[PDB]
Design a protein around this ligand. Structure first.
Ligand SMILES: *C(=O)c1cccc2[nH]ccc12
Ligand SMILES: *C(=O)c1cccc2[nH]ccc12
Lengths: 304, 304
């Protein structure tokens, strides 16, 4: 028993991290097969970031200008191209540590692990969720750009995120591995305000199921609700509307605990309306929303 | 910016995990050089755990009874010995993935990462603290025994914990890598109640400094306090007494923020006395105590 904000083992990703330098800018790159993926803003100076013309800036760069280092060994760059907001640096050597991998574009509410890196070296790993406003609440300092988000299914690493920037509000924006930003964000230093950060209702419910499975049951009540009634309360508290798809996804957790999804929604409704009254759930004093129903099943069953 | 409960990159430890089976019991082992370390309760049946005589149970076991598997390859056991509550299985092959390592016995209040494993396979990584009552609040299911806790300093892995058991209260107990339990716990299925789980005051203060560094400042007040006055409040709230050693350890954080340690203690005192009033600090609605002052500096500076 016990329930923790758990990240995937980072080893498969650690073997892919490299350092990319272009001019005076150093960030991280992801080396998979004979391609190194990195944010295209590696070609910018802090001054260029105000209004950069990436195509024009890239014309002044040749293969020899991208310095790619894996550990202490230099990789030879034999090609470069820009795909959306990422650069693809073709190198002459396939990464021998390349795991089985996929590039996936995740939906808001889905979780992933981040391997924070600096100078191609890993500093730490933590679990994130893509927020409904397409930002992530990470831990990234200057030099962390190019650090990636991923999920692991047995031996396959699904890369879903690459770090690009911090908004003036302290939240983070990045792209999928095709270089398309999540949300409306652009790789420019301009007024980019994030929209409403709503709570991921289905994840909160999944975490309430995890609480019951791990012994915390004080919040269970004698009530039930309907999807429409619950959603009226969810609207009031800036929670995402719960759908029948969400109810269906919570089916296995409902089956394991014997608590019907709508009964758990009524517990959640009372928790939103009355608060925790100084109590905690799974060591938290707020309703946690960065565990998907898949994460709860995975952690509660011990999938490796 | 941004502050997360971050674990160390787990790759160096992933390469050390193996599966150990003895009879019908399968748990994890740690393969370092030509020795595999695992909990001695691998030789027990669930029935033996009530009152096990480990020396007598071990007499009935030979080298060929300990099945050690690294991935899908079988390791040959050429010796076995019991050191305290761990078994040391000498194998004929040195682990080629052995990192630079140390075995350290940590003090209560210190943090470490845990690589949860099942059948020698990693499932996830999370950050823990050794509680003042010598338990850890982990996420461990049956089969996770032998999963280890560690810290990393550049290329050296300092192993500090090996998982052995869950107390009837849902908290976890384990040993250092010499097989000595943290706290008064024994590898027996008996009434083992944990003592008072006090809050790690110096860690809470370090996390308050992290909050100020990352933009959350609402809790800063116009007050100061003394070590003795603060400790009277800390006693009342089951917080560990703050010492001058703790103040000294917070020196670099005090210097970086310009907030004197005792002024931060006065903010903490007001937070204990008045609560959060429905507000949050670094996305938490309670005072976080599983970040040491070293963790805060490390994460805020980006050490790899
Ligand atoms: C990313 O790593 C990044 C973003 C902004 C500024 C900066 N300087 C160096 C690297 C960066
Ligand atoms: C540890 O992994 C462990 C503890 C208690 C019970 C159990 N059965 C198999 C393995 C275990």
């Amino acid at each position: 028993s016990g329930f923790r904000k758990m990240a995937f083992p980072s080893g498969k990703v650690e073997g892919c991290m490299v350092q990319v330098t272009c001019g005076t800018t150093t960030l991280n790159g992801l080396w998979l097969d004979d391609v190194v993926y990195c944010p295209r803003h590696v070609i910018c100076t802090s001054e260029d970031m105000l209004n950069p013309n990436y195509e024009d800036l890239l014309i002044r760069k040749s293969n020899h200008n991208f310095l790619v280092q894996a550990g202490n060994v230099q990789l030879r760059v034999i090609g470069h191209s820009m795909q959306n907001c990422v650069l693809k640096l073709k190198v002459d050597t396939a990464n021998p540590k390349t795991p089985k991998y996929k590039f996936v574009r995740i939906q808001p509410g889905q979780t992933f692990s981040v391997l924070a890196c600096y100078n191609g070296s890993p500093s730490g790993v933590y679990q994130c969720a893509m927020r409904p406003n397409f930002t992530i609440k990470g831990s990234f300092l200057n030099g962390s750009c190019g650090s990636v988000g991923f999920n692991i299914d047995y031996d396959c690493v699904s890369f879903c995120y690459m770090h690009h920037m911090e908004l003036p509000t302290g939240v983070h924006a990045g792209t999928d591995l095709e270089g398309n930003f999540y949300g409306p964000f652009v790789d420019r230093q301009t007024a980019q305000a994030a929209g409403t950060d709503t709570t991921i209702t289905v994840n909160v419910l999944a975490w309430l199921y995890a609480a019951v499975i791990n012994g915390d049951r004080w919040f269970l009540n004698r009530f039930t609700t309907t999807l429409n009634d619950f959603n009226l309360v969810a609207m009031k508290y800036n929670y995402e509307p719960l759908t029948q798809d969400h109810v269906d996804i919570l089916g296995p957790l409902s089956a394991q605990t014997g608590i019907a999804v709508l009964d758990m929604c009524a517990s959640l409704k009372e928790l939103l309306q009355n608060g925790m009254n100084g109590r905690t759930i799974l060591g938290s004093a707020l309703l946690e929303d960065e565990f998907t129903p898949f994460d709860v099943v995975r952690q509660c069953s011990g999938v490796t």
